[PDB]
Every structure is written in structure tokens, then in C-alpha cells.
């Protein structure tokens, strides 16, 4: 049958892709970096504690100004914090209480959010604050969204797909099909021409925004991929998973480079981010702690212990000055 030789040819191509990757494993990232000096022990302290959320915090995102940050909470609100003074610039009551994610536009004029309502809502900040667009099209929950500019935005959903939206027309320009599980996170490449996504299928995918196609698929995790973040230079990305390990994947090499794990860590990872230089990889864990990893040597550099419930999100500012941590205990803390 032809269906047979299409399942068989897919196996023969999966083998061809595995062999082509092994042929590039002349060395490891740990062998290459055995000579550079360790980073020492990173000792950050809580600079700000953001109080104002009445329930679990689910997601946060930094503004380009490295000062303003937006957070989405179980209390059905978005709070845009002024991290320098802890004042609440804005407080947005949402039309739906099932919010899951939030994003800050590069220009700082709009914010986006969504969740089980299966809608990506754009909120104009420029004088009142009301919804300017409801982006409907997904048949599953909105897991993550990131602006390209004030006119385009990429989303990830529980319907196992991603999408690019035109904000003015509200249309679903292109869709990104390929995943076989709920897509849980997306990260845009610095040049905005590609983005990666992590799903519950335990695989990550590199997509072309313009071509709307999937270029590469990165497997290796044993469970759902909850978080994903691009390496500052756009040639690699990190992933957090329920298997209690973080993993670094290189694009030009097309495979995994490093696993950040420990027999002492059992719970899953909820968020990931890189320091401005990419040297440090921060990860939010389900054991209430955020672990700072050495991205190059894989050693555990530091720990951010200050939350009494799950750490559900984190993010490093563009200037790398501080790092934010959102928790199920309703607080956002700024470490530096």
C-alpha cells in the first residue's frame, strides 16, 4: 500500500536526520568549555517585591524600557508595574477570568493576554485603557503571545498550532501547524524572522515567520516542554520541561548541546531566560525556586529562593540589569 511506504519512508527519513546529526557530534559543549573559568557563585538579592495580585500569577513580560512589566494573574487582571518604584501604572480587569499569558509590545503602547477564552486580546495603553482588538481563530487556549510590532503578533495555543495575526484587520494571516501536542510557549528570534515553540509532544520547532513553514524539530525531552527562550544571538535556544531538566539546542548544529539537570531536582521547569550575554540561563521551577545555570559549563551557579509557591514565570530585562519572578503566591519579585 502507499500509506505503508509513507509511514516507512518517514522512518527512513527520521533515521537519515539522526545520522546527519551524529555526524556532527565531533565534540560536546562541555568538552569545548572545559578551559574557561567558572562564573563563581551568583548571589542576587530581592530589590523589589510587587504586591497587588490576589491569586496565582501565571505569566509576565518585560517592556523594552527594562522598567515596565506586565503580569497576568489568576485574579483575572493584568497589572503593569513600574518596577523602579513598585507603583501600579495600570490595572486591567479582563473580560475573561481564565487568563494564562501576557506580553508587552516593543513600543510599549499595547499589551496582550489570553487563556481559556481562546482569544488574544490587545489592550491599548494610550485617555483610557480598553480592548482595541479581540483576536479569535484558535480552537484551544492561548498559551503565549509575543508582538512582532504594533501591527503583527505571534500566538501559541492548545490546539497544537501557532499563528501570525494582523492587528488592524484582526485576521489570522498564517498558521503554523506541525505539533502533535498543546503548544505551551513561543520565543521570537532577535531578528524577528524566526521563532521557536515548545509543546506537550516533548519537541520544539523552529518556524519562519514569513514563509509560515517549520524548518527544524528538536526532540530530546521526556515530557511536556513548558518554556522556551532564544539565545541572545539567535543561533540557539533553551527549553524547560516537566522532566526536571533544561536543554540547550543549537540551530546550525541541529541538535541538543547541553542538559541542565540534577538528581537533587525532581519538579518541572515553568520558565526560562538568558542573561544579556547568554552566559547565564535562569529557570523557574515548581519547587518554588529559580535556579541560575551556567549556560556554557552546565554547573548550577545560583538559586533564587523567595517564593512560597510555584515560580510560574521569569524574565531578564533587555539591559540585563534585573530578573523578575512571578509565583503562584501572587507576588512578583525583582532580583538583581
Amino acid at each position: 500500500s502507499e500509506l505503508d511506504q509513507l509511514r516507512q519512508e518517514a522512518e527512513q527519513l527520521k533515521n537519515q536526520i539522526r545520522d546527519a546529526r551524529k555526524a556532527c557530534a565531533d565534540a560536546t559543549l562541555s568538552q569545548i568549555t572545559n578551559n574557561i573559568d567558572p562564573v563563581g557563585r551568583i548571589q542576587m538579592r530581592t530589590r523589589r517585591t510587587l504586591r497587588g495580585h490576589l491569586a496565582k500569577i501565571y505569566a509576565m513580560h518585560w517592556g523594552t524600557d527594562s522598567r515596565l512589566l506586565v503580569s497576568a494573574s489568576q485574579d483575572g487582571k493584568l497589572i503593569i508595574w513600574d518596577s523602579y518604584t513598585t507603583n501600579k501604572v495600570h490595572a486591567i480587569p479582563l473580560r475573561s477570568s481564565w487568563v494564562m499569558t501576557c506580553a508587552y509590545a516593543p513600543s510599549g503602547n499595547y499589551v496582550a493576554c489570553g487563556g481559556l477564552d481562546n482569544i488574544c486580546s490587545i489592550y491599548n495603553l494610550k485617555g483610557n485603557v480598553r480592548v482595541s482588538r479581540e483576536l479569535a481563530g484558535h480552537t484551544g487556549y492561548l498559551s503565549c503571545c509575543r508582538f512582532l510590532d504594533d501591527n503583527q503578533i505571534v500566538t501559541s495555543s492548545g490546539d497544537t498550532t501557532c499563528a501570525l495575526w494582523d492587528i488592524e484587520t484582526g485576521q489570522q494571516t498564517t498558521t503554523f501547524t506541525g505539533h502533535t501536542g498543546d503548544v505551551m510557549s513561543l520565543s521570537l528570534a532577535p531578528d524577528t524572522r524566526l521563532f521557536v515553540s515548545g509543546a506537550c509532544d516533548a519537541s520544539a520547532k523552529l518556524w519562519d515567520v514569513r514563509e509560515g513553514m517549520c524548518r527544524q524539530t528538536f526532540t530530546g525531552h521526556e515530557s511536556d516542554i513548558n518554556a522556551i527562550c532564544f539565545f541572545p544571538n539567535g543561533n540557539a535556544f533553551a527549553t524547560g520541561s516537566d522532566d526536571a531538566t533544561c536543554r540547550l539546542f543549537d540551530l546550525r548544529a541541529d541538535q541538543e548541546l547541553m542538559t541542565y539537570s540534577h538528581d537533587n531536582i525532581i519538579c518541572g521547569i515553568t520558565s526560562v531566560s538568558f542573561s544579556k550575554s547568554g552566559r547565564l540561563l535562569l529557570a523557574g521551577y515548581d519547587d518554588f525556586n529559580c535556579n541560575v545555570w551556567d549556560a556554557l559549563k552546565a554547573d548550577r551557579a545560583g538559586v533564587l529562593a523567595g517564593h512560597d509557591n510555584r515560580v510560574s514565570c521569569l524574565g531578564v530585562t533587555d539591559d540585563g540589569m534585573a530578573v523578575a519572578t512571578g509565583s503562584w503566591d501572587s507576588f512578583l519579585k525583582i532580583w538583581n
Partner: protein
């Protein structure tokens, strides 16, 4: 003391409460006394579209109450010209061809029965059942309806709610008092019946039956039966709130005035028949009809009272030998012989005879022998002084066999009205109490019970909706609406001083006032306004915003718990914590328990399917 209406914020909880029971339809709200007055108050004043529809309906109702044709002939034309002809000329007559022709046909032919505009009544409701009723719900007149419907479903009557007065009746199981309801000032009668003296005579069954019997007949406002408005009990007594009849019974007045002439006895017979027609239409045989059970009001009109021995024959016909000896039909005395309403028609003849001759038709030589009075029941020669019309009446009412008894021949009470003894009476004038009454009334121990004995009376408390609404409509309904209108308009006009609502524009499920428990040793109850969302329960004080909440995930179970004999809700939290809530009324508590249960069950089944929200190891 006085009725206090709940705040308009009650609309959120009551509307979902009524909608869950299909009580938010045009049929059910329009046919309620207070519902009609508010729906009318909405159309006539606050909606120019529905103003003529109600005035036409109301004019038809007034037309139905006209007494003579000369009054209908003069009104059927006004109603026709104003609400039929004038509309046809403007092409705005929103009715079918049948309704219009049916009325005009009877007009040009001068045949004007009181039911002339019935085909219009059916279509006036059809015109209101739709869009007008929907805008009515959206209006603030339906909010007030929810405010009134809340106080009705929160009625918990105790002895304190009544100002008890003098005694007006004694029996084997209790006394009847004249009382005044403090709520509305309505004068009632309170039949207080002793639970102790009940078990001592093993009359527990009859007690529950009378209240069941009073319920079957207390609808429709019958002017010739002593009907029930309320029923409640204490650990010791049972209380019936009945129509007040402070004129005594006929048994007493018969012994005072002596036998009544044929004309005086025709008055009581007419009004007693109409009362029987009320029961018989509702499948109730009184069985115990005698002068002692006929009460006079202050003017002399009479009602039948005490439905203890009455029973429903809608399903199965009674065969027991129940009643008072001397008034029981042959079918009744004969045990194992089912009977119908005929017993009352026979009892009527037995009673009416005694009103004329001073003794029951069978009680001979003033005998005190029970086995001889029932013997004669199974000829009964009538004196020569009885007129042929009266003689033929009792002759049909007292026939030994039911196949020939007057009133048991097919048409019911109509067969007794058509009797030539009542040929002079206009029964509409009897129903309207227009006839002059002939008589104007001038002005043990060593017994216990509990637990297993108080479960028999758990379904005893009751409230007749029609009775309570009719009581409120004719007392404080208008006065309370005016005081509540001025009181509500101040808070809003005054809130413009302070200042949007927290429930609009979101996915809020329900909101209202609740009292959450603080430190119990301090009787600390915090009255907060709660907001229930699909994933959390928020609450706040006045002026502030919700600063706390409780998530549906934290909630494990929702139970009902008694705290100081007040219905409260017990929410058990996952962290071994507990959360107690108290409501202002039962409908609020019933709704909060359902919604909270539905909210925590739907939210938890949903979270499990969201990998980012559910709990993991």
C-alpha cells in the same frame, strides 16, 4: 416590625433563583397579584408601547364585574369605540380578524355577556407575552418584583409575628384566637392546636390532613369558606392562620335566636352551597357539615370552617364512617361503602332541617342515643308547615339512595341552585354577599413528645402565595414601594458623591451580600459584598475594592451547617481550612450553594485539562 425590602442588589441572586425553576415567564409573573401590579406599573407609566394594551385589558376586567346588561350595553360600546374602533381607523389594531368580529357581532345584536371580550383577553396576553415582557424583565420594575419575591420566600412566622388577642373558639385539640399580623396589620384568626393533646387522642393524622385540606381550597379567595393564609408550629403547638370570623357559629345562634323561618334559612343555605361548590370543584368532601361548623362574620354572612374531617377524593373515594351523627348520609354510615360529594348534599339537608325545627331530622324525642339516630338514616316525614318548594328541596337532598339525591345527579351544585326553593335568588348577588343576613351578631398532663414525634410536623409549615400577596397588596404594598423608592433613589443620587460597578463588563456569575465568619468567640460576622467568578470568589467592603478572595481550586466541598439555628454554608479548603458563610434569606442561601457547587466542580474539571494551570507532583 414592618416589612423591610432588600436592596436592589438582590436582583442578581433572585433572578437566577427564579430562572432555575422556570418562574421567569409571562404566565407565572402576570398571574401573581404583586407581579401583575408591578408589570402593570411598568407598562402604563414607563412604556408607551404597552400602555394601551393594559388599559384595554383592565377595562375588560372592569367590564366583567358589571352587574346588569344596562351597564354592559353602556360599556361594551365605550370599550369598542375606544380600544377597537379607534384602533382600526389607525390600522394599529394588533389583533386577529376573529377577535374583532366576535365582539362586533355581539354588539350589533345587543347580546352582551360578561365574557364578551374574552377572545381579546387571550390575544392581549399574546401581545404582552413576548417583547414587552422581556423589556419588563430588563426594567427596574422586575427588580422590585425580585425584592418582593425574596421577602415572600424568606417568610418564617413565629408567635412574635402575631399579636394574639381574645379566644373565639374551643375544641378537643386546641383553641382559636383572634390576632393581628404585625407585618401588615391584617386581622386574622389563629387556630392554636396542642401537640400534647393531639397524641393523647392519637389525632396526629387529622391534624396534618386539615392543613392539606386547607391548602386545596385556600386558592381563589372563596368568600364562603374559612381559608388558610399561613401554617406554622412551635415545639408545643400547631398554628393555623385563617380568615377571621368573629360572629360565632350557627350552633350558638340557633340556641339563641331559635329556629329560623324558611326565608332566614334560605340565606344560610345559599351561601353554604357556594362554599360547598368551592370544595367540590376542588375534590373535597366536608363530611362534617352542621351548624357548629358554620361561622358568621361581623355582618352575618357565613363560611364553612374546620376541614379536619374533610378529605380529597380526586384519586380514591373515601368509605370511612366519618362525620357527626344525625348529619351523615346512609352511604357514609355504611362502612366499606365508598361515597362522593353526596354526603355533603345529604348533610346539607340534615342541617337545613335543624335550622327550621331545632333538632336534627333524625334525632327523635330529644334522644341522646347514637345507635337510634343513625338507624332512622337507613320516609322521614316533614311537617305540614313546610312549603312545597322547601318540601321538594329537602325531599331531594335526603333521598336514601344516591341515584335520586338532589345534587348527585350530574351537574353538581347547579342542581341545588335550580331548586324551586331558590327561584327568587340571583346567585351572582349571593356570591357578592348582597343579600341581607337574617342574624347580626351583637358585640391531660403526664404526656411528652420529641424527636420521633416532631418529624410528623416537619412539612407542616406553609405559606399560601396567593393569600400573602393579596394581604400585602391591600395593606403596605403601595406604602412600602414609595418608602423604598425614595430610599433607593438617595443611595444612587448620593453615590454620585462617592462614585462604576465591579460586575459589569466581565464574566461574573453572581453577586450579592453575604456574611463571612471571623473569630467565632467574638460573634464576628463581616458583612461583605461577594462576587462569584468561574474561578474565584471575591468580596469587599464599602468604598473599597475586593482585597481578598477564595479560588474554586481551594474549595473542596460545600455543605450546609446549622450555626445557632441559622442555615449557613461550610466551605472546606484544601489547606485544612474552613470557610463559613451566612445569607440574608433562604433563596440567597439555596442559590449560593448550587452556584458555588457548580463553580468549584466545573472549574476543577477544567483545570485538570490545562497543563499550565493544574497541580503537578
Amino acid at each position: 416590625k414592618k416589612i423591610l425590602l432588600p436592596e436592589p442588589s438582590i436582583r442578581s441572586v433572585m433572578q437566577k433563583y427564579l430562572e432555575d425553576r422556570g418562574e421567569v415567564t409571562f404566565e407565572k409573573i402576570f398571574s401573581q397579584k404583586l407581579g401583575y401590579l408591578l408589570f402593570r406599573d411598568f407598562c402604563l407609566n414607563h412604556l408607551e408601547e404597552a400602555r394601551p394594551l393594559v388599559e384595554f385589558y383592565e377595562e375588560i376586567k372592569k367590564y366583567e364585574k358589571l352587574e346588569t346588561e344596562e351597564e354592559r350595553v353602556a360599556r361594551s360600546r365605550e370599550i369598542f369605540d375606544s380600544y377597537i374602533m379607534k384602533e382600526l381607523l389607525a390600522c394599529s389594531h394588533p389583533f386577529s380578524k376573529s377577535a374583532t368580529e366576535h365582539v362586533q357581532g355581539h354588539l350589533g345584536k345587543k347580546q352582551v355577556p360578561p365574557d364578551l371580550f374574552q377572545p381579546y383577553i387571550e390575544e392581549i396576553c399574546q401581545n404582552l407575552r413576548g417583547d414587552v415582557f422581556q423589556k419588563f424583565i430588563e426594567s427596574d420594575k422586575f427588580t422590585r418584583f425580585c425584592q418582593w419575591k425574596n421577602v415572600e420566600l424568606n417568610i418564617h412566622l413565629t408567635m412574635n409575628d402575631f399579636s394574639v388577642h381574645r379566644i373565639i373558639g374551643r375544641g378537643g385539640f386546641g383553641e382559636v384566637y383572634g390576632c393581628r399580623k404585625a407585618d401588615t396589620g391584617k386581622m386574622y384568626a389563629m387556630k392554636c392546636l396542642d401537640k400534647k393533646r393531639i397524641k393523647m387522642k392519637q389525632g396526629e393524622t387529622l391534624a396534618l390532613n386539615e392543613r392539606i385540606m386547607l391548602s386545596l381550597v385556600s386558592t381563589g379567595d372563596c368568600p364562603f369558606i374559612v381559608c388558610m393564609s399561613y401554617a406554622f408550629h412551635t415545639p408545643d403547638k400547631l398554628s393555623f392562620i385563617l380568615d377571621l370570623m368573629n360572629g360565632g357559629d350557627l350552633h350558638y345562634h340557633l340556641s339563641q335566636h331559635g329556629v329560623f323561618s324558611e326565608a332566614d334559612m334560605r340565606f344560610y343555605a345559599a351561601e353554604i352551597i357556594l362554599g360547598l361548590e368551592h370544595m367540590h370543584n376542588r375534590f373535597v368532601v366536608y363530611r362534617d357539615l352542621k351548624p357548629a361548623n358554620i361561622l358568621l362574620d361581623e355582618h352575618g354572612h357565613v363560611r364553612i370552617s374546620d376541614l379536619g374531617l374533610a378529605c380529597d377524593f380526586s384519586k380514591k373515594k373515601p368509605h370511612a364512617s366519618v362525620g357527626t351523627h344525625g348529619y351523615m348520609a346512609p352511604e357514609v354510615l355504611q362502612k366499606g361503602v365508598a361515597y362522593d360529594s353526596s354526603a355533603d348534599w345529604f348533610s346539607l339537608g340534615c342541617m337545613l332541617f335543624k335550622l327550621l325545627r331545632g333538632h336534627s331530622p333524625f334525632r327523635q324525642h330529644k334522644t341522646k342515643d347514637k345507635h337510634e339516630i343513625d338507624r332512622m338514616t337507613l320516609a322521614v316525614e316533614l311537617p305540614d308547615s313546610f312549603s312545597p318548594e322547601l318540601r321538594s328541596l329537602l325531599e331531594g337532598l335526603l333521598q336514601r339512595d344516591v341515584n335520586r339525591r338532589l345534587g348527585c345527579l350530574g351537574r353538581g351544585a347547579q342542581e341545588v341552585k335550580e331548586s324551586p326553593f331558590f327561584r327568587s335568588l340571583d346567585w351572582q348577588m349571593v356570591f357578592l354577599q348582597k343579600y341581607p343576613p337574617p342574624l347580626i351578631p351583637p358585640r391531660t398532663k403526664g404526656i411528652k413528645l420529641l424527636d420521633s414525634d416532631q418529624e410528623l410536623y416537619r412539612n407542616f409549615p406553609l405559606t399560601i402565595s396567593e393569600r400573602w400577596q393579596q394581604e400585602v397588596a391591600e395593606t403596605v404594598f403601595d406604602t412600602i414601594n414609595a418608602e423604598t423608592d425614595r430610599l433607593e433613589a438617595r443611595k444612587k443620587a448620593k453615590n454620585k458623591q462617592l462614585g462604576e460597578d465591579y460586575a459589569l463588563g466581565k464574566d461574573c456569575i453572581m453577586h450579592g451580600y453575604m456574611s463571612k465568619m471571623g473569630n467565632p468567640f467574638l460573634t464576628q460576622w463581616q458583612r461583605r459584598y461577594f462576587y462569584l467568578f468561574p474561578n474565584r470568589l471575591e468580596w469587599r467592603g464599602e468604598g473599597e475594592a475586593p482585597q481578598s478572595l477564595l479560588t474554586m481550586e481551594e474549595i473542596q466541598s460545600v455543605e450546609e451547617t446549622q450555626i445557632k439555628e441559622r442555615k449557613c454554608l461550610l466551605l472546606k479548603i484544601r489547606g485544612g481550612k474552613q470557610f463559613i458563610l451566612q445569607c440574608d434569606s433562604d433563596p440567597e442561601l439555596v442559590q449560593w450553594k448550587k452556584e458555588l457547587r457548580d463553580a468549584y466542580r466545573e472549574a476543577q474539571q477544567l483545570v485538570q485539562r490545562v497543563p499550565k494551570m493544574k497541580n503537578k507532583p
